Copies of this chain bind each other. A is one copy, B any other.
């Protein structure tokens, strides 16, 4: 199981169908009255908290990518894609960058990125060698 800890109950990611690859992470601007909206100007970035901390199982990791709706807004994750290790315990942040020409305003709890949980090879299970075994593709 993925264990999920929420800063506020409304940070709960949007769960899709049984077949969904991912769950939608939402902006969390806080609970104060002024937390209703935040704006990202063209060429600027904003570190957005999701209010979601996760315990991903050992052997898996979290991939954070934009929702397709982010594409129309010309927003991207500044570091392209978030990689959430299974030992990470803080809340997931989305550092969103405005590569378009118009200012983008976001609502509190708006769905912005997908969290997909995938398996990975153990990064300690490697061996340094002097030559690798050749293949037709090679290069």
Identify the A interface with B (CB < 8 A).
Answer: 1-6, 12, 15-23, 43, 45, 53-58, 60-61, 65-72, 74, 76-90, 95, 97, 99-101, 114, 116-139
Contacts and interface: CB of A to CB of B under 8 A. Distances in A.
Number of copies: 3
Contact of A117 (B90, B120, B129): B120
A23 B3 CA distance: 24
Nearest to A138: B89
Contacts of A76: 80
22 contacts: A1-B125, A3-B126, A3-B132, A4-B128, A4-B129, A5-B132, A16-B137, A17-B135, A19-B87, A19-B137, A20-B123, A21-B123, A45-B71, A54-B132, A65-B81, A67-B79, A77-B80, A80-B80, A87-B136, A88-B137, A99-B99, A117-B120
A3 B129 CA distance: 6
A116 B70 contact: no
A66 B97 CA distance: 15
A118 B120 contact: yes
A86 B21 contact: yes
A20 B5 CA distance: 20
A132 B71 contact: no
Contacts of A118: 118-121
